[PDB]
Amino acid sequence: PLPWCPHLVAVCPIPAAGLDVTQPCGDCGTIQENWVCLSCYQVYCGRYINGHMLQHHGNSGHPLVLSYIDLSAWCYYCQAYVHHQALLDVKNIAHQNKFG
Ligand SMILES: O=C(O)CCn1nc(-c2cccnc2)ccc1=O
Ligand SMILES: [Zn+2]
Ligand SMILES: [Zn+2]
Ligand SMILES: [Zn+2]
């Protein structure tokens, strides 16, 4: 996993409502394998379910998404996981909500 990527600048402030790691996919409502967009904080399912976060990436261009299964962050442009101090606040909020 990368220690930086050129899309970290697109990570936006966490909503004051916080994160809900049990939030269903905004398109198909599935509770399985969802991700949260780190630009707009919409929640959509992963590639192995109905691929709605990949569709969101396509229709918005938003780069970075956070897994509600394992709190990894994937950048769709870099095609890699990313670890950076800039992602700690959001991973921590998600971790607190998930575990707790
Ligand atoms: O499931 C998603 O939509 C995002 C998360 N993610 N996406 C991919 C991926 C994306 C597009 C094409 N091939 C692989 C690879 C690893 C990963 O963690
Ligand atoms: Zn879905
Ligand atoms: Zn988005
Ligand atoms: Zn990137």
UniProtKB/Swiss-Prot annotation:
It comes from the Eukaryota. Zn(2+) 3 binds at residues 37, 40, 56, 62. Zn(2+) 1 binds at residues 5, 7, 75, 78. Zn(2+) 2 binds at residues 25, 28, 45, 52. Phosphorylated by AURKA; phosphorylation increases HDAC6-mediated deacetylation of alpha-tubulin and subsequent disassembly of cilia. Ubiquitinated. Its polyubiquitination however does not lead to its degradation. It is found in: Cytoplasm; Cytoplasm, Cytoskeleton; Nucleus; Perikaryon. Induction: (Microbial infection) Up-regulated by the presence of SARS-CoV-2 N protein during viral infection. The SARS-CoV-2 N protein enhances HDAC6 stability during infection by reducing its proteasomal degradation, leading to elevated HDAC6 levels. A zinc finger (UBP-type) spans 3-100. Histone deacetylase domain 1 mediates the E3 ubiquitin-protein ligase activity. The primate-specific SE14 repeat region contains seven SE14 repeats with the consensus sequence X-L-X-Q-T-X-S-E-X-A-X-G-G-A and mediates binding to valine. Forms a trimeric complex in the nucleus consisting of BANP, HDAC6 and KHDRBS1/SAM68; HDAC6 keeps KHDRBS1 in a deacetylated state which inhibits the inclusion of CD44 alternate exons. The complex is disrupted by MAPK1/MAPK3-mediated phosphorylation of BANP which results in BANP export to the cytoplasm. This facilitates acetylation of KHDRBS1 and CD44 variant exon inclusion. Interacts with SIRT2 (via both phosphorylated, unphosphorylated, active or inactive forms); the interaction is necessary for the complex to interact with alpha-tubulin. (Microbial infection) Interacts with G3BP1; the interaction increases during SARS-CoV-2 infection, promoting the association of G3BP1 with the viral N protein which disrupts stress granule formation and facilitates viral replication. Belongs to the histone deacetylase family. HD type 2 subfamily. This is Protein deacetylase HDAC6. It comes from Homo sapiens. The lineage of its organism: Eukaryota, Metazoa, Chordata, Craniata, Vertebrata. The chain holds residues 1109 to 1208 of 1215 of the full protein.
